[PDB]
Design a protein around this ligand. Structure first.
Ligand SMILES: Cc1cc2nc3c(=O)[nH]c(=O)nc-3n(C[C@H](O)[C@H](O)[C@H](O)COP(=O)(O)O)c2cc1C
Ligand SMILES: Cc1cc2nc3c(=O)[nH]c(=O)nc-3n(C[C@H](O)[C@H](O)[C@H](O)COP(=O)(O)O)c2cc1C
Lengths: 220, 220
């Protein structure tokens, strides 16, 4: 098993910073980048839903086409080693074909599936109130994809690989772009969040966070 | 700098599983659990919004009060060492006082603030269409808190401490419950997600995930 001291764990999450300036001469090995993607694939997700898809956008022409509506990463698109656009599943209702696969991956038998479907329905409809509209239910999947996002960042960091998480683009324009390019079915998926990966070309900014006393309330 | 091999990074995310059964005779040390909290505090977040608050629910009475509407952690409420209920910030509009503190942590002068506010309005109103209603704006904050959740699960795993993310509870009753105890302002925050921590009483269940070829689309 992988074990670290508190000092090592602190440094790992302290050393990961948002890299906005990448060295264009350095690329991540195929072995290293596969490892990053694995951090995403292995991430936990609510009821094992795994509602993500990781588009890896290495095509230079597609990257260029995104610049005019991707201000959050416009200078990173040229220089980063790798770009992942994470999609989230649309309409992941408890009764959709999508949850049939969720349960098959669990090896549920028919009676367990009936209980699981009741669980999912309760969670979605009553506990979490996700079935109000398409957007709330999509955002539930999206939340899960940010878990994958976070583990990919941390995993990149552990490998000595710099990253930047990315929201700064027009989402309608991004969805239209990528869907028009044939990269996903827009009725089935939509863009959730993005992230660049590479090796920094400039200095990383000092961490700036709220204090621990500001963000924690102990209820003893 | 903390550095891991590819194999160690994989094992970090294979060894972490959702712990349903905690040994009640085993407690996380105060130092270890502060380290876990630091993983969440140091997490990245969109425009550095850090829109989380971490409620550490150690009180036994209060844990017991939560049991009847928290089916997703019924046995865990009793046996786990530590419980965190993560809140996300409500109504985190670009022009809110919440964002006055966001810019202040970034040391922005007056000119930098008017540019940042213009960037925040663009992101919320046009790019991400977060201002449709209160819930879409909340769910944006909630997505950031799932990064902090992920990093606390991962940091715990590197310390050798087991965890389980928790959505399985009635959100309306839990909001009502924690607010009634006077633990947060329901008009400023709402419950996002929860997580248990401690030491597992059973061996790790093998991962079941979609394959890498199923979740990755390479666009060369
Ligand atoms: C956001 C979220 C909420 C979850 N809620 C619960 C819960 O309430 N009860 C539970 O036992 N597991 C919960 N889990 C754990 C998942 O069921 C689990 O991650 C999935 O089945 C994969 O198993 P693994 O994490 O052990 O690989 C949740 C996971 C996530 C990411
Ligand atoms: C979901 C999300 C989206 C982000 N989008 C952007 C982006 O579009 N452009 C950018 O340069 N930074 C982006 N960031 C990075 C944050 O601005 C950054 O994490 C924070 O301001 C500074 O902290 P750090 O360097 O400690 O990560 C984003 C971060 C997250 C979590």
């Amino acid at each position: 098993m992988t074990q670290l001291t508190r000092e090592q764990v602190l440094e790992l999450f302290h050393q990961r910073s948002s890299t906005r300036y990448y060295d264009p001469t350095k690329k991540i090995s195929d072995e290293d980048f596969e490892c990053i993607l694995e951090c995403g694939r292995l991430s936990p997700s609510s009821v094992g839903s795994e509602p993500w898809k990781f588009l890896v956008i290495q095509n230079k022409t597609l990257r260029e086409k995104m610049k005019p509506f991707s201000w959050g990463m416009i200078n990173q698109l040229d220089n980063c080693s790798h770009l992942v656009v994470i999609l989230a599943k649309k309409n992941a209702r408890y009764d959709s074909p999508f949850f049939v696969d969720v349960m098959a991956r669990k090896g549920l038998n028919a009676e367990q599936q009936q209980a699981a479907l009741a669980k999912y329905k309760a969670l979605q409809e009553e506990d979490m109130k996700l079935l109000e509209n398409d957007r709330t239910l999509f955002d539930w999947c999206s939340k899960q994809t940010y878990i994958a996002l976070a583990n990919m960042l941390t995993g990149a960091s552990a490998l000595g690989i710099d990253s930047c998480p990315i929201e700064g683009f027009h989402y309608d324009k991004m969805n239209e772009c990528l869907a028009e390019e044939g990269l996903f079915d827009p009725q089935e998926y939509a863009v959730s969040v993005a992230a660049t990966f590479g090796y920094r070309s400039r200095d990383i900014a000092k961490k700036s966070r709220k204090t621990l006393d500001e963000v924690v309330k102990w209820v003893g």
